Swiss-Prot record:
Gene induction: Up-regulated by the Ca(2+)-regulated transcription factor NFATC4.
Keywords: Acetylation, Aspartyl protease, Cell membrane, Cell projection, Cytoplasmic vesicle, Disulfide bond, Endoplasmic reticulum, Endosome, Glycoprotein, Golgi apparatus, Hydrolase, Isopeptide bond, Lipoprotein, Lysosome, Membrane, Palmitate, Phosphoprotein, Protease, Signal, Transmembrane, Transmembrane helix, Ubl conjugation, Zymogen
Protein name: Beta-secretase 1
First and last residues shown, out of full length: 60 to 446 of 501
Organism: Homo sapiens
Written domain comment of the UniProt record: DXXLL motif is required for a proper endocytosis and retrograde transport to the trans-Golgi network, as well as for regulation of lysosomal degradation.
Tissue: Expressed at high levels in the brain and pancreas. In the brain, expression is highest in the substantia nigra, locus coruleus and medulla oblongata.
Extracellular topological segments: 1-363
Subcellular location, record wording: Cell membrane; Golgi apparatus, trans-Golgi network; Endoplasmic reticulum; Endosome
Enzyme class (EC, first level): hydrolase
GO CC annotations on file: axon; cell surface; dendrite; early endosome; endoplasmic reticulum lumen; endosome; endosome membrane; Golgi apparatus
Keyword Methyltransferase attached: no
Role this protein plays: Responsible for the proteolytic processing of the amyloid precursor protein (APP). Cleaves at the N-terminus of the A-beta peptide sequence, between residues 671 and 672 of APP, leads to the generation and extracellular release of beta-cleaved soluble APP, and a corresponding cell-associated C-terminal fragment which is later released by gamma-secretase. Cleaves CHL1.
Family: Belongs to the peptidase A1 family.
Ways its activity is controlled: Inhibited by RTN3 and RTN4.
Amino acid sequence: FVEMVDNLRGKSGQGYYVEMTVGSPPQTLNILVDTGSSNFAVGAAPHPFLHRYYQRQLSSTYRDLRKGVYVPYTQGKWEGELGTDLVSIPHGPNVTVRANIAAITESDKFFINGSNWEGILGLAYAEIARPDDSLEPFFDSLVKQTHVPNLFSLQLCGASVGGSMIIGGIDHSLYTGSLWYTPIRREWYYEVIIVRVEINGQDLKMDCKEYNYDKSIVDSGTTNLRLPKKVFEAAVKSIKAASSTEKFPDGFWLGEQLVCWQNIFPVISLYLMGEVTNQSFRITILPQQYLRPVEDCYKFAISQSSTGTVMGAVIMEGFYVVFDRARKRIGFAVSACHVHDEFRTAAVEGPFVTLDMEDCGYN
Ligand SMILES: Nc1nc2ccccc2cc1CCC(=O)NCC1CCCCC1
């Protein structure tokens, strides 16, 4: 899959994008890779932020679905006109599919000023597609229409970021050690179950049901590791107790200010439900994952949420992540490109014994 190695680019804090082509003749666009949404949506109008946009008038293969789509969120919106057209990934499988495309015609706080992407590829399942679950997501169309195996994997490496999206397979050069798999609880977001959290090896002794209130997802379209508040404060409570060589204001635990140089911070381990009854594994991240530079200087990349846990780039940049859709599971392995110092490396370890892992899920 050497074709697809290094097929992801971006800028710190602006997401990871892949090159795609839409229409005939092919129109090239940079498209954010997003495992926390399910719409393939592209700029279709000359927004001043945009390098380029989908020009439906130039495409002989374009078909109008004569239906609009309105997507409000926190805190912005995009909206557009639904159609289908021919889609390829130049540095992906050597195929071309007819996919749904939302031509974005109005937008608010969606596109980033200074970014190099013009659209978004929702890689999650139809249940969270807009307007409804009848709009077939891109990856579903891809798997149906070709012989591309029903999985993809992401190596996000982290001004310019790099990475790999391996479509239809796994490149073993992108990781070391073994992959460990956690069940996809339900096919809407990439939902998983966290069963135990350790700050510096120390348990948080919270009812594990709290770690998944009301869900926990894997999301390449989110920068931070995001935790339910009730879990977040207990997590912060421990993190700032483990960090007592220096002092930091309560505004920073959001965060606001920056440490600036020319070990005091604890490692973080999430235990995830395993493939076998009463069996789990753990993924361990460094401070060099939840301490992100802005523009030796760093910010605090863990924050609170009301929609559940979000395993974003903070988590994902330490690991090679396999979205094994065919077997309803997600694999984690230590990434070959993750950033480590001489004292600590990010880790994926198992098996561990954990009882009552079902009680950790919220219904
Ligand atoms: N991953 C993401 N991608 C996004 C892309 C555009 C606007 C908002 C986004 C938010 C997230 C965070 C995950 C999330 O809350 N997803 C729920 C809906 C939000 C509306 C779009 C479909 C998915």
